[PDB]
A paper describes a structure:
The biocatalytic reduction of the oxime moiety to the corresponding amine group has only recently been found to be a promiscuous activity of ene-reductases transforming α-oximo β-keto esters. By studying the crystal structures of enzyme oxime complexes, analyzing molecular dynamics simulations, and investigating biocatalytic cascades and possible intermediates, we obtained evidence that the reaction proceeds via an imine intermediate and not via the hydroxylamine intermediate. To gain more insight into the reaction pathway, we determined the crystal structures of the two enzymes OPR3 and XenA in complex with the oxime substrates 1a–c, either by co-crystallization or by soaking. All the crystal structures obtained had a high resolution (1.9–1.35 Å) and showed clear electron density features for the oximes.
In general, XenA structures showed a better-defined electron density for the substrate when prepared by soaking, while for OPR3, clearer results were obtained by co-crystallization. The propanoyl moiety of oxime 1b points into this cavity and is likely stabilized by hydrophobic interactions. Substrates with an acetyl moiety (such as oximes 1a and 1c) give the non-productive binding mode described above. Comparable experimental pKa values are reported for chemically similar oximes and for the 8-hydroxycoumarin and para-hydroxybenzaldehyde. Substrates of ene-reductases usually bind with the hydride-receiving atom within van der Waals distance from the N5 of the flavin and with an enzyme-dependent angle between the flavin N10–N5 axis and the atom receiving the hydride. In the cases mentioned above, none of these criteria are satisfied, and the binding modes very likely correspond to catalytically non-active complexes. Thus, we will refer to it as the “non-productive binding mode”. The calculated high Kd for oxime 1b clearly indicates this enzyme’s low affinity for the substrate and might explain why this enzyme performed poorly in the biotransformation of the other oximes in our previous work.
Residue numbers in the entry:
A (entry chain B), B (entry chain D): 2 to 360
Write the structure that this text describes.
């Protein structure tokens, strides 16, 4: 089974090709994770996945999506992650973390509490920042404040500080969240970046925030640990051909800037899109990025069955398969995939107190 | 769905009829549970089961099965369970514990480390006790020491002390382990009880240790919390008709002694048996116990498919369906059952951070 071949990137070895992608839990308070996350991540790591990327973790308070999002903007926040890192490691999985800034999509309600921007009368909300003072729209109508040059310098430092905190907490894998219409993605997209200074206008200027943030993180992130990013390479906004070509060129510059692997996703920068949802629909897009940027990739959004995950590898589209919702439904999904794929001693994807009885 | 009707017993209400039966994890050290159990139990409780009965927990060190078994023979041991109790309650499940004494099956290796008796001279092994100085045989050759009347008094008091500690840790449900060939079961079975004093020989005498332990525990266990027991009602030794009839009579005396529910199982007292290798063979047996002893019952051994569990409840065979190994494979099995049975808002069998996305 290709899905259960180990994978080595820099000096880190994943025991299989199953990655749990970042998945916000909305259960933190003031950015501080707690027993919800401890059990959530430990249980999934024991389920057998080779890599567990902890949810989008805010580099700054206003970079949270919701009042329930995790943060790593202080050392106490980072210390809260230590037992999570150690629990993922004890299960034999590799602990990773996605550090993020929600940009204009910040200051929103939890998904089951409206999923929409928090109103100005609500005391829980806050002012959002973004490259330009233009709203996402739809259920996220709050217009963000346009960032100053000092904002840009401060946020980049927040990414540096968060990467250093993630490193010191013991994460062996970091993912910069440059996707899904949050801050980084919105600097790259002309839909949301209306700037005329050095951070908007041209391709170089729109790339500048992401390339500089990557460069600043690379200076503090160890060379022997994978430095990755999630990036939306197309929007399904009717401009996919040119957007994908620009996104792949940026991925080439990420590679030259020391990025080890690209988590290929959709931009979600604006609501006015037509995303063709279907099983493994990102397959050919991830493969094109993989081949044209010559960079290892993972992807998500419909690979969450054993056969689809395996086929994505057999087809040389992905190096790692990210399986998200299936792991919320079944924290031991990796074990389920091992069985479904007829892996030898499949039950031993799990720790002995389970494996012995399921063989 | 009958499986997702709530169930009320004394002052406890289970949100559904799915019980997680006790399942030894063999991960404790000197009886002390740890982060293995914390995540294991909290994750399963979040999976949606209405009742989680924590594994066989030894009332005394020599009553462990293995060096990895949990114990509750001191207040420090009981304190270790408090976070487990509270995590199970926080997920909306009801915390239970099975208190146990392995009898002549004690001092054995973990199942995946040989599963056989450890010699008492071995630093990890110890001397076993039983109603009669007769070995189980096969891979459990250690001959136990026949218990004196003072031994009987000591062990019953250990059950009492353990029930008090379980109450103080916050357990809302207790199960006496009188099954599976351990101490209590072996007092009841003529195969293992060769005593001629007041605790062997007749039906009354063989029943005495179990009835006296129940009575002693009944004194300290709160009237408003279910007092339950697990008992092997037949052995598949060719004496099943006479054995089951005596077992149903003991269930009647259990009820008269204040037992609230009986977990019906197999004896496993000796190895020379022909136990059915198949699912749900206990259904009609448990139904007979339920109807002839007029006592609520649960059972296990192969009910871990949603349709089988639903069928056992529709047939009035069980009041609760115990689903064990399926929860080792999938801690969210209760959610999987909700889906398969077409329960409305099935995803909300799970907490919101999962439920919202699985709709
Ligand atoms: C509850 C939930 C939270 C998510 N949070 C994040 C996140 O914090 N960062 C991110 O990059 N993607 C996030 N995603 C997107 C997932 O990482 C993944 O791409 C998505 O679930 C699709 O993959 P799947 O079909 O296997 O579920 C989230 C998805 C879900 C369902
Ligand atoms: C790993 C494991 C540990 C078990 N430990 C106990 C136990 O401690 N006490 C008990 O009464 N039964 C124990 N059993 C028996 C189970 O509680 C249950 O009766 C058995 O798994 C049959 O149910 P199932 O078919 O749903 O798995 C254990 C079973 C397993 C698989
Ligand atoms: C619309 C896609 O955005 C995401 O997946 C996300 N984070 O990146 C969430 C849901 O928190
Ligand atoms: C074979 C029947 O015995 C059991 O089920 C058991 N405990 O009761 C264990 C720890 O396996
Ligand atoms: Cl000890």
């Amino acid at each position: 089974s290709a899905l259960f071949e180990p994978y080595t990137l820099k000096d880190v070895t994943l025991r299989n090709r199953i990655a749990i992608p970042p998945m916000c839990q909305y259960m933190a308070e003031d950015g501080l994770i707690n027993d919800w996350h401890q059990v959530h991540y430990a249980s999934m790591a024991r389920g057998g996945a080779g890599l567990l990327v902890v949810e989008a973790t805010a580099v700054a308070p206003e970079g949270r999506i919701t009042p329930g999002c995790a943060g790593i903007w202080s050392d106490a926040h980072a210390q809260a992650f230590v037992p999570v890192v150690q629990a993922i490691k004890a299960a034999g999985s590799v602990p990773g973390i996605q550090i993020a800034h929600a940009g204009r999509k910040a200051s929103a309600n939890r998904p089951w509490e409206g999923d929409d921007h928090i109103g100005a009368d609500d005391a829980r909300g806050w002012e959002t920042i973004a490259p330009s003072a233009i709203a996402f729209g739809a259920h996220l109508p709050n217009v963000p404040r346009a960032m100053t040059l000092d904002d840009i310098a401060r946020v980049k430092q927040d990414f540096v500080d968060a990467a250093r905190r993630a490193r010191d907490a013991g994460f062996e894998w970091i993912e910069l969240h440059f996707a899904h219409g949050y801050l980084g993605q919105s600097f790259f997209s002309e839909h949301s970046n209306k700037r005329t200074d050095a951070y908007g206008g041209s391709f170089d200027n729109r790339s500048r925030f992401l390339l500089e943030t990557l460069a600043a993180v690379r200076e503090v992130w160890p060379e022997n640990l994978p430095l990755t990013a999630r990036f939306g390479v197309l929007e399904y906004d009717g401009r996919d051909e040119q957007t994908l070509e620009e996104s792949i060129e940026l991925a080439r510059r990420f590679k030259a800037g020391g990025l080890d692997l690209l988590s290929v996703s959709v931009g979600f920068t604006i609501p006015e899109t037509n995303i063709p949802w279907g099983p493994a629909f990102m397959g050919p897009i991830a493969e094109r990025v993989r081949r044209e940027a010559k960079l290892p990739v993972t992807s998500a959004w419909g690979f969450g069955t054993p056969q689809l995950a395996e086929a994505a590898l057999q087809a040389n589209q992905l190096d790692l398969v990210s399986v998200g919702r299936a792991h919320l439904a079944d924290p031991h999904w990796a074990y389920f995939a091992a069985k479904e794929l007829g892996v030898e001693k499949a039950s031993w994807t799990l720790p002995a107190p389970y494996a012995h009885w399921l063989e």
